[PDB]
Enzyme design. Structure first.
Site, PDB file in Angstrom:
ATOM      1  N   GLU A  50     -33.423  20.982  30.568  1.00 35.63           N
ATOM      2  CA  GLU A  50     -33.932  21.924  31.550  1.00 35.63           C
ATOM      3  C   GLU A  50     -33.015  23.097  31.825  1.00 35.63           C
ATOM      4  OE1 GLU A  50     -35.115  19.703  35.032  1.00 35.63           O
ATOM      5  OE2 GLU A  50     -36.379  18.353  33.831  1.00 35.63           O
ATOM      6  N   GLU A  93     -41.501  12.612  27.912  1.00 35.82           N
ATOM      7  CA  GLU A  93     -41.837  12.025  29.229  1.00 35.82           C
ATOM      8  C   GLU A  93     -43.313  12.091  29.605  1.00 35.82           C
ATOM      9  OE1 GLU A  93     -39.180  13.695  32.107  1.00 35.82           O
ATOM     10  OE2 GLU A  93     -37.490  13.701  30.782  1.00 35.82           O
TER      11      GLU A  93
END
Length: 330
Positions: free
Chosen positions: A130, A238
């Site tokens: 991220e 995910e």
């Protein structure tokens, strides 16, 4: 009783996010039947495994590793460098801010310690998570890692991890990175890292998706093609498929509507068909959870509600989406 992993064995690894409690009861049996990859949900995050400079918490990760070894599974290492869940000791030097080279040295020691302990069972690492700015125009998310090490910190993390990861593959992991605005940004950063010799093997697409996104399928195809054109593997790291649009924060639903259940089975069948299609470039598909009995989507983005994002229902039973995605022949 087809095993999902066995069914997908020729395409990619099939993985689930876990903590030690998942090794018990129904979750235990679901994992050993259907999954050949585990990602520690929390226990490898920096603050959790390494809360003080001289204190590592290896017990939970050892159990996960021991479990994976006993059941012929392998791990994804999630995650080394992330703007969240990094304890404050890393950035402090007594009463001052630690300088660049002290932070780098701490990070090297942390990576050496953790990658050495687990590289025998870990087949891919989320080295950096991220890092790409999600909300403004600028490429890189502001974070203490970035502020103190400088814009090189992504390449630095990767060159460190490379030293201690054996031949596990090294990934850059992020969310919304299939969406038009973020895909472009992330393409640039990755292309520029790879041009500088960063040993990134792949892009992790977190795939926090919902049944309402009309662009999902086209975004997902355009994303996989774009990253692959970099020579990168793709992992879906995910995956879950919420019944709610992100901004739909309603808390009343005690169960999904029939429109929800049916749209979800279709969205799952559809994304897995895309996964199968790009099987030459996708090496692993991990779901963020085992069954709807336990999902972080119950508390995010709304504390205390209920969501049903996964393949097994609240009793641990295969949902419609499950029978959808095992429906094909090779």
């Amino acid at each position: 009783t087809v095993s999902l992993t066995e069914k997908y064995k020729e395409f990619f690894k099939i993985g689930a996010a876990v903590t030690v409690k998942d090794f018990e009861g129904i979750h235990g049996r679901i994992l050993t039947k259907h999954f050949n990859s585990l990602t520690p949900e929390n226990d490898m995050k920096f603050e959790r495994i390494h809360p003080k400079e001289d204190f590592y918490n290896f017990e939970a990760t050892d159990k996960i590793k021991d479990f994976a070894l006993k059941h012929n599974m392998q791990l994804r290492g999630h995650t080394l460098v992330w703007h969240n869940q990094t304890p404050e000791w890393v950035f402090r030097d007594n009463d001052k801010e630690a300088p660049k080279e002290l932070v780098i040295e701490r990070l090297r020691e942390h990576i050496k310690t953790i990658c050495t302990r687990y590289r025998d069972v870990v087949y891919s690492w989320d080295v950096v998570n991220e890092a790409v700015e999600d909300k403004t125009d600028v490429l890189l998310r502001d974070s203490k890692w970035r502020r103190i090490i400088g814009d090189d910190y992504i390449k630095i993390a990767f060159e460190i991890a490379k030293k201690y990861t054996g031949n596990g593959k090294l990934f850059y992991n992020d969310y919304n990175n299939e969406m038009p605005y973020k895909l472009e940004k992330t393409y640039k950063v990755l292309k520029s890292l790879l041009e500088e010799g960063t040993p990134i093997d792949g892009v992790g697409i977190q795939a926090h998706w919902n049944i309402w996104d009309k662009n999902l399928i086209d975004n997902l195809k355009r994303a996989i093609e774009t990253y692959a054109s970099l020579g990168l593997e793709i992992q879906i790291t995910e995956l879950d498929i919420s019944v709610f649009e992100f901004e739909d924060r309603r808390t009343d639903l005690l169960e999904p509507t029939e429109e929800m259940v049916e749209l979800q089975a279709k969205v799952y069948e559809d994304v897995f068909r895309v996964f199968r299609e790009y099987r030459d470039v996708i090496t692993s598909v991990t779901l963020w959870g085992i069954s709807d009995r336990h999902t972080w989507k119950d508390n995010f983005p709304v504390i205390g509600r209920k969501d049903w994002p996964l393949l097994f229902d609240i009793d641990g039973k295969p949902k419609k989406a499950f029978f959808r995605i095992i429906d094909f022949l090779e």
